[PDB]
Amino acid sequence: LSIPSMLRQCVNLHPDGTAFTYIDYERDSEGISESLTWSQVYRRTLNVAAEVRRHAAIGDRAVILAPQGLDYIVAFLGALQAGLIAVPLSAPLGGASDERVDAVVRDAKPNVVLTTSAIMGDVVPRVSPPTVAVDQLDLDSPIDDSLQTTAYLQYTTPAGVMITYKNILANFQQMISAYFADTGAVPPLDLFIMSWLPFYHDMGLVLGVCAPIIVGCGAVLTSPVAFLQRPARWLQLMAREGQAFSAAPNFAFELTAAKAIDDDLAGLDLGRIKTILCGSERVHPATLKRFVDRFSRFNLREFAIRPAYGLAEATVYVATSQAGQPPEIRYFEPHELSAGQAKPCATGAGTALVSYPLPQSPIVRIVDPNTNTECPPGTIGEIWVHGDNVAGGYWEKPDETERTFGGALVAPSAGTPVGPWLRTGDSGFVSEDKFFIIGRIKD
């Protein structure tokens, strides 16, 4: 039913199984691991929940301003355990990033701020609500109020996407069914999650923090700076024992192919990697090819690479490639694409695009954004999305909610709901029964 309840079940079933392992490379370029079992992380979460209840009531917002690490995870889970609506943000980094933080805090109006003692002095100016240094609590002392609906707000004029447990669970059902379709929607026994994505991004939170609990497997986590410093670390950590499930944007596939150092890869066997999602940015076929052409020499399988389309307003996932096959690439004439039409062209020529199966859940339609009517196959329009993973709106923003989540189709085709539809702002088309993403409709 909810993340707190599923964490409790993880403890009941496998209290001594390793849940989260965080690798810090600041003090040793080989990495220092710190791990928690399910029982350890649950205890820490209960201790955070007890603290936050002293400051905030059920349904209040709890902003999280903490560096990447285990304290972030227990702050987020502890907020949920106490029935608070968590608001995951980044540590204060300066510049625009700090004015984003200030604007989110004024929008979400939190009654508690969860942080760490190391950055406490940087956090206090950014927030009167009590500020709790999570690492200074007695997190491992021996020791519910959760909601069943709204879990957290995902910001990314600040508009906080309201994400419910129903949204999360529906999106995980959709993801597990699509990613693992070739094994009957059953993940392998030795799956593990590996992520360096920041927890204040949708994919980093959903994969790094939520998925271990919902799927019931351990996670191996590090920070984005550790990856950027030495990109081979991503491959080293995915090559740990078991079948890794990871994710990154297109730029990081390119950077790893271009900058991972061969000697850091010596002896790695990438042939057990289950899935590497490529998502949150337009997926470039040329980048996927450079990545697989290099890392197939270490046994990476091309069917492990899964382009993934989505957005925070849909929790995270909308569509992905067919399980058990490498990405399908199709080619289209560029002059016609600029004119709004998809015209196939010879393999390799024109514009290469990833071809996605139309998802069975959620559903996708290509819609003319000025007439609210579905486009014929081949005509470019806005991608509209419908399904139980689609959020119910932006926090305390009725008007922006109507504009973004209130799409309504004129004369919908058979089997297509009138609405409400999430208007993604993304442009795309359907061609030969496959789905394609081009860009943004504003363009």
Numbering used by the authors: 4 to 130, 138 to 153, 159 to 171, 177 to 463
Question: What did the publication describing this PDB structure actually write?
Answer:
The N-terminal structure was compared with that of the complex with ATP or AMP-PNP, and the RMSDs were observed to be 0.4265 and 0.3836 Å, respectively. No obvious changes in substrate binding sites were observed. At the same time, after analyzing the structure, no extra differential density was observed, indicating that the N-terminus of FadD23 could not capture fatty acids from the same expression system. We inferred that the C-terminal domain serves as a cover for fatty acid binding to FadD23 and is important for the function of FadD23. The protein of the M. tb FadD23 N-terminal domain has no fatty AMP-ligase activity. Based on our results, we believe that the FadD23 N-terminal domain alone cannot efficiently bind fatty acids without C-terminal domain and the C-terminal domain plays a crucial role in the catalytic mechanism.
These multiple methyl-branched (hydroxy) phthioceranoic acids are synthesized by polyketide synthase 2 (Pks2) using an activated fatty acid starter unit provided by fatty acyl AMP ligase FadD23. FadD23 is one of the 34 fatty acid adenylating enzymes (FadDs) in M. tuberculosis. FAALs use a carboxylate substrate and ATP to form acyl-AMP. The full-length M. tb FadD23, containing a large N-terminal domain (1–460) and a small C-terminal domain (473–584), connect by flexible loops and an anti-parallel β-sheet (465–472), was obtained.
